[PDB]
Amino acid sequence: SNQKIASIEQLSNNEGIISALAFDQRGALKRMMAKHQTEEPTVAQIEQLKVLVAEELTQYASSILLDPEYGLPASDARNKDCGLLLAYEKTGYDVNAKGRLPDCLVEWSAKRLKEQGANAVKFLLYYDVDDAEEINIQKKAYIERIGSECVAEDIPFFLEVLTYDDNIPDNGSVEFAKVKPRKVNEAMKLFSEPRFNVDVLKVEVPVNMKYVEGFAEGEVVYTKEEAAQHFKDQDAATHLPYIYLSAGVSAELFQETLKFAHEAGAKFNGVLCGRATWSGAVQVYIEQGEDAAREWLRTTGFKNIDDLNKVLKDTATSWKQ
Amino acid sequence: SNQKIASIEQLSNNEGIISALAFDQRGALKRMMAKHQTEEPTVAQIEQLKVLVAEELTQYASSILLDPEYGLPASDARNKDCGLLLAYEKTGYDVNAKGRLPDCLVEWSAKRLKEQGANAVKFLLYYDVDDAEEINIQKKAYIERIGSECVAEDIPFFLEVLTYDDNIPDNGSVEFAKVKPRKVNEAMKLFSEPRFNVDVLKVEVPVNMKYVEGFAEGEVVYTKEEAAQHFKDQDAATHLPYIYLSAGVSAELFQETLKFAHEAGAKFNGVLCGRATWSGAVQVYIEQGEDAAREWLRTTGFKNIDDLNKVLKDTATSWKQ
Numbered sequence: 001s002n003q004k005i006a007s008i009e010q011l012s013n014n015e016g017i018i019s020a021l022a023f024d025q026r027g028a029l030k031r032m033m034a035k036h037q038t039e040e041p042t043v044a045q046i047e048q049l050k051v052l053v054a055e056e057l058t059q060y061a062s063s064i065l066l067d068p069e070y071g072l073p074a075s076d077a078r079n080k081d082c083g084l085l086l087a088y089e090k091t092g093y094d095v096n097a098k099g100r101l102p103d104c105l106v107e108w109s110a111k112r113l114k115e116q117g118a119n120a121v122k123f124l125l126y127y128d129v130d131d132a133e134e135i136n137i138q139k140k141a142y143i144e145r146i147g148s149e150c151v152a153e154d155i156p157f158f159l160e161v162l163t164y165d166d167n168i169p170d171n172g173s174v175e176f177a178k179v180k181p182r183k184v185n186e187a188m189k190l191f192s193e194p195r196f197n198v199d200v201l202k203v204e205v206p207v208n209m210k211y212v213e214g215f216a217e218g219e220v221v222y223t224k225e226e227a228a229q230h231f232k233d234q235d236a237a238t239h240l241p242y243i244y245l246s247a248g249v250s251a252e253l254f255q256e257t258l259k260f261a262h263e264a265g266a267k268f269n270g271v272l273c274g275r276a277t278w279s280g281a282v283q284v285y286i287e288q289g290e291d292a293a294r295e296w297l298r299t300t301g302f303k304n305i306d307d308l309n310k311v312l313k314d315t316a317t318s319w320k321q
Numbered sequence: 322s323n324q325k326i327a328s329i330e331q332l333s334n335n336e337g338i339i340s341a342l343a344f345d346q347r348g349a350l351k352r353m354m355a356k357h358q359t360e361e362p363t364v365a366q367i368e369q370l371k372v373l374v375a376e377e378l379t380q381y382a383s384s385i386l387l388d389p390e391y392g393l394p395a396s397d398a399r400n401k402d403c404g405l406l407l408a409y410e411k412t413g414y415d416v417n418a419k420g421r422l423p424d425c426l427v428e429w430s431a432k433r434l435k436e437q438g439a440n441a442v443k444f445l446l447y448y449d450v451d452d453a454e455e456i457n458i459q460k461k462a463y464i465e466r467i468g469s470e471c472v473a474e475d476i477p478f479f480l481e482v483l484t485y486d487d488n489i490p491d492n493g494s495v496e497f498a499k500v501k502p503r504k505v506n507e508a509m510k511l512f513s514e515p516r517f518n519v520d521v522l523k524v525e526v527p528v529n530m531k532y533v534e535g536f537a538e539g540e541v542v543y544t545k546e547e548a549a550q551h552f553k554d555q556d557a558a559t560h561l562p563y564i565y566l567s568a569g570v571s572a573e574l575f576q577e578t579l580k581f582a583h584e585a586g587a588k589f590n591g592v593l594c595g596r597a598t599w600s601g602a603v604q605v606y607i608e609q610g611e612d613a614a615r616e617w618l619r620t621t622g623f624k625n626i627d628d629l630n631k632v633l634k635d636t637a638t639s640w641k642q
Contacts, residue, residue, distance in 0.1 A: 107458045109465035111516060137428045144430035145470055152472035152518070195432060197473075 003154040004199055008241075008319060010083035010119045011063035011156075016318025018200075018243050018270030019309055021277060023053055023074070024067040024087040024122070032279070036286040043070065049285055049293070050074035053278050056297040058082040060305045065122055065272060067091075068108055075117065085158060086118040088146065093126060099135045100126035100164065102142045110149035110157075120156035121146070122202065127161050129186040140190075147197035160202040160245065161187045177208040177221045181230045185237045192238040200319070201242035202272055206234040209249065209257055228264035241269040241319040251276045251304050255311045262315035269319035271312060277304045324475040325520055329562075329640065331440040332384040332404035332477070337639025339521070339564050339591030340630060341384040344374060345408040345443070346596060347391060353600070357607045364391075370606055371395035374599050377618035379403035381626050386443060386593065389426055393437065406479060407439035409467065414447065420456035421447035421485065423463050431470035441477040442467070443523070448482050450507040461517075468518030481523035481566065481593070482508045498529040498542045502551040506558040513559040521640075522563040523593050527551040530570070530578055549585035556587045562640035564591040572597055572625060576632045583636035590640040592633065598625040 012018045029049070033041045050066065051074045058064055058079035065085040066075050075084055088108060093100035102125055113121050123146055127139055143159065150157035163183040168176040184206045191198055207230050211221035222230070234242075244261070246254045254276055261268055280300055285293035333339045354362040354370070368391060375395040379385055384404030387396050396405055409429060414421040423446050434442050444467055448460060464480065471478040484504040489497045505527045512519055528551050532542035543551070555563075565582070567575045575592075582589055601621060606614035 104466075107462055109462045110469055111465045112462060141428050141430045141433060144432045145425075145466065148430065148432055148470035148473040149466055150469075150473075152469040 001154065004156055007119045007154075007156045008199065010081075011085065012083075012270065012319060013062040013309070015313060015316075016269075016320055017312060017316045018063065018241075018272070018319060019061055019312055020063040020065050020083075020085060020243070020270070020272045021053075021057060021061040021305070022065045022245070022272050022274030023050055023278065024065045024071060024085075025274070026067055026069055026091045028091075029282075032282050033286060036283055041286075045286075046070050047073050048290075049282065051077045052285070052290070052293055052297065053281065053301075054078045056294060057278065057301060057305060060302060060309065063119070068105060068113070068116070072116065083119045084117055085120040085122045086113045086116065088113060088121050088123045089125075098166075099131070099138070101135075102126070102139055104146075110146065110153045110155060114153050114155050118155070120158050120199070121150055122158040122160055124160040124162060125191075126164055127187045127191075128164050128166075129183055129190070130165070143191065143196050143198075147195070150199075151197045156199040157197060158200045158202050159191055159196070159198045161191065161204075162247075163187065163204065172208060172210060174211065174219055174221060177211045180204075180208055181206045181233065185230075185234055188234070188238045188242070192240055198240060200269075201238055201240055202245055203234075203242055204245055204247050205257055205261070206230045209253060209260075212260075215253075215256075228260075231261050231264040231266040235266045235268070243270045243272050244268055245272045246274055246276045248275050251307070255307060258311050258315040267317040267321065268315075269321075270316050271308070273305070273308060277301065277308065322475060325477050328440045328477050329521065332406065333591070333640060334383040336634075337590070337641050338633055338637045339384065339562075339593075339640065340382055340633060341386050341404070341406065341564075341591070341593050342378060342382040342599070342626070343386045343566075343593050343595040344371065344395075344599065345386045345388040345392065347388060347412045349412070349596075350391075350603075353603050354607065357604050367391045368394045370603070372398045373606065373611065373614060374602060374618065375399045377615060378599065378622055378626060381623065381630065382594075384440070389429055389434070389437070396437065396439075404441070405439045406441040406443045407434045407437065408443050408445070409434060410444050410446075419487075420452060420459075422456075422459060423447070425467075431467065431474045431476060435474050435476050439476070441479050441521075442471055443479045443481060445481040445483060445523075447485055448508045448511075449485050449487065450504060450511065451486065461511075464512065464517050464519075468516075471520075472518050477520040478518055479521045479523055480512060480517075480519045482512065482525075483566075483568075484508060484525065493529065493531070495532070495540065495542060498532050501525075501529055502527045502554065506551070506555050509555065509558040509563070513561055519561060521590075522559060522561055523566055524555075524563050525568055526565055526578055526582070527555040530574060530581070533581075536574075536577070548581070552582055552585035552587040556589070562590040564593055565589055566593045567595045567597065569595070569597070572628070576629065579632050579636045588638035588642065589636075591637050592629065594626065594629055598622065598629070 054074035054077040063083035067087045090103045212227045213223045284296045372395045379400040388408045411424040533548045
């Protein structure tokens with residue numbers, strides 16, 4: 001739709017590519033900040049940090065993903081051409097309870113996110129194509145609600161899917177590394193159905209690079225030809241725009257992953273780059289002060305995102321294809 | 322909208338007065354069935370019971386409120402000219418928690434309610450207008466959410482507001498009666514706002530009648546003229562169509578109420594008529610047999626709903642006036 005079209009435009013760069021900078025972390029940002037004090041850090045500090053990354057980096061990113069809990073200040077503080085995505089999900093899951101069931105931050109509607117200047121709504125779903133139906137019917141129902149909400153509100157709905165298995169507790173394990181292709185791919189095929197009214201898929205690379213021939217410094221799980229195929233399968237697995245999420249892999253492995261994707265023939269439409277662009281500034285902020293972090297950002301930070309945008313320009317494909 | 326209008330007319334009769342049978346009760350019914358033997362009521366017992374009541378009485382009602390968990394079979398069963406609304410809220414709330422927070426039926430969405438052929442979608446909300454904003458911001462956001470879904474799914478949004486005040490535990494008290502008009506009327510003013518996309522309001526009569534002059538075998542809270550102003554204020558409080566909920570008052574007093582309503586000037590558009598009119602048939606069903614309960618429904622049952630319809634034809638203004 002036109003307004004949906006207009007809105008996704010504000011989140012992409014000149015070549016038609018989404019280059020959002022992810023900074024919607026909450027409980028996780030506190031943890032990282034903990035380490036340098038290590039004592040509980042203030043809401044004030046946490047907002048302030050985001051504001052800095054906002055202020056200093058938004059000029060080089062085509063958009064930013066921030067959270068309504070602490071990111072509203074930083075989102076006022078953002079740049080002009082930059083654009084904006086707002087996280088709608090409650091963070092984490094229940095360690096006690098089964099299913100990592102989805103749940104919107106209780107003081108928010110799609111309507112409230114739109115009135116706050118957001119160009120898209122994002123929502124993180126933990127899904128597992130093999131979990132019980134009683135689990136997945138809920139997760140499904142939920143997404144239909146957001147799917148529907150957003151349509152009435154004329155605002156892009158970006159679905160983030162993270163994959164998991166109760167059987168396979170540990171994520172980067174060899175055992176899970178075998179099933180990731182199915183788990184990721186299959187989720188996309190499902191949530192590509194029109195009844196979810198999804199606009200862009202936010203997803204992980206369909207393999208775990210750390211076990212790809214020519215990348216692994218331990219056990220290999222797929223040969224390059226194999227893994228190239230899994231990317232192709234992923235490209236084909238949806239007909240909607242998709243972007244890759246870094247998911248705490250490094251600035252440089254992720255850079256290398258894009259070129260790899262591209263060369264397998266994956267026509268992906270951009271990225272969403274998080275911990276791996278700004279993370280060095282957390283330390284420099286706590287240990288060494290405000291203008292100290294402002295420095296890192298204008299050098300180590302800008303380099304990281306430049307390097308990224310340059311790789312992206314050679315690798316990604318415009319979302320309008 | 323074109324569809325919402327055409328759908329509401331599936332719920333009214335052809336003279337424009339909504340006369341919906343309330344039969345969405347869950348836990349509440351289940352107990353009833355165990356008030357005839359202190360043992361278990363089965364999932365398919367409840368189903369066929371609901372079926373039975375729907376088959377008989379939906380001849381003489383222009384719509385039926387039912388529920389997804391126990392009323393899917395009865396919804397197929399209904400008479401052809403009976404409209405269908407499906408409940409969307411989890412029944413009750415958490416008694417250990419504070420603010421009677423609302424919550425959808427986990428396997429549902431306004432999309433999956435339309436897909437079962439519901440001409441309308443219903444949400445009972447407990448609202449106290451003077452409750453803390455930390456509570457009420459959640460309520461408003463939740464309603465904003467459901468409203469959008471229904472806009473997008475192009476289906477009517479019927480919101481029911483039952484009022485309360487935690488400072489006044491007894492709803493039937495003299496202290497409550499005094500505050501009732503504002504609690505009721507103000508919540509109508511809030512939820513008539515465009516952001517909540519409400520199509521029809523299911524609301525209580527703005528006064529406790531047990532204390533209106535010349536109705537009050539006890540103590541008076543308002544003169545006939547004060548009460549009339551409260552009905553007048555109610556009708557004025559909203560520009561949407563609204564229908565009154567019997568709220569467990571007797572058939573006699575309720576009927577008497579609709580006359581007072583019409584006389585004060587309230588242009589109310591019908592009633593949601595509740596358990597009172599089908600109750601008696603439960604004990605006959607169980608203890609007396611299936612063909613017996615069917616008789617009750619054809620004679621006693623018929624009578625209660627027919628009577629109401631008559632008072633209704635002499636009292637309610639059309640939702641389209």
